[PDB]
Amino acid sequence: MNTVPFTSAPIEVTIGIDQYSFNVKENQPFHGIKDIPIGHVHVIHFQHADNSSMRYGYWFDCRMGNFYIQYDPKDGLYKMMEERDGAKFENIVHNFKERQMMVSYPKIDEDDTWYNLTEFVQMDKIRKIVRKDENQFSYVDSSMTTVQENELSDPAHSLNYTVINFKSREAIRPGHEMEDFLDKSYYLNTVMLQGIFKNSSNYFGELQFAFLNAMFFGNYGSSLQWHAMIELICSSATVPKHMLDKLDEILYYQIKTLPEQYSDILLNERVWNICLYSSFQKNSLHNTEKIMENKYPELL
């Protein structure tokens, strides 16, 4: 079980660790989070009690080093940092655990929620969407723009999501205009899966990462990526049987986890109605369609 210690909690803040969240008071004796399951990515995220604007956070994998949080009173945020001195860190953490100044990652044993939302998400692929190659962890926030947003402004502080554009020379073969526009199988299978992603796992990986950035940070560009990657599959007549069965499970858990009160801004009416009712795959997402109908019948 891994630990992310904190130096202190000098400003009052809501701390998220994956799907969980805890309120910490200004100068409350808080020294971080223990019992974090090894083997999965994690995100630790923040919303200041004084600014419910700029939700921000850190994607990290505990196997890739010893990480802690320290408040920076110049830049005014909780910063992720790496402690390279193994013994100092072990010693720091043991003092704080002995003093019980740490909250426990509160995994329920039956609960596979986090595995199901992160199944294909790989820290090494996150570090290529979020480029800050001097850190093992990746910062994301509410206002970060995507590379595709910047095309239609700082290239260093962007989400390098795979560009998907249904009205692009990339997506449409000359002399196959009508065919490729109404059936995106060639854009999905040859251009995206064979050409760019190499396999379905990397495609599902970016899709799951876009959704989680949307949900945890209200990142608008991420929400657009997540919908785009869903629409590319729903609008393809030819999709491997295992991709569809796995997509149905992916979306089921995403829809299950979405805060009830956020469906209005995080769900795109046109994409979901298309996928579930209009598209080639209307009969292929049984779990997703059942949860969407019982939980968000309004949207449809």
Partner: protein, 237 residues
Amino acid sequence: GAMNSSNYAELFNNDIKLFVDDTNVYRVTVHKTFEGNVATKAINGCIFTLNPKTGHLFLKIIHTSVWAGQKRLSQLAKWKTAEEVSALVRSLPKEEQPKQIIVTRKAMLDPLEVHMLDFPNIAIRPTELRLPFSAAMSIDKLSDVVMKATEPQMVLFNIYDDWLDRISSYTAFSRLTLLLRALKTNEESAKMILLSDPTITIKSYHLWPSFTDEQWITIESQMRDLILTEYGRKYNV
């Protein structure tokens, strides 16, 4: 974005533009089968592609053979339209290519946009205008060339005849829409008005009768009267 009465004179500036109407591309007669079911029989169609400044009409004839063995023909018709317009633009020298193409129906936007991905500098636009281009096939000489075609064919017309020798393109376009609006509301009445005085003829190289300027005012007057009445009848007002 979309073209309306608030940016109307844009049609007659010196930026090359074309209207594309696809309303006569896919044409059918509906008939009863021997077993008493209903079937369609396709007839020849046309793409109405008009330079509203010059009056140059690029009439692409759509021969019924293009539909042979195809499914979802109303949908294919929009993609066949986009394919032909695109082929037409690529056939023109660069200095003759349109800077904008305005489609009369919004369903043509995505087909044409996709077929013109090679031309990012050509703006594809809808219109809020209700243009009567559907009535193109009430023009005898255009209907004649479409119905006689035995193969796909492109025929070039000037839909203004020689009018621009005497009037501006704003006025020539206004006369054209008045003529086509009349033909669309009551083909028979409109056609009687245009040929009632058999001393006025249509030249071999023209579409419309050779009216003096005063005769055109009278004709124009009669088309407005026709349009107004039919509207009273339609709405009982």
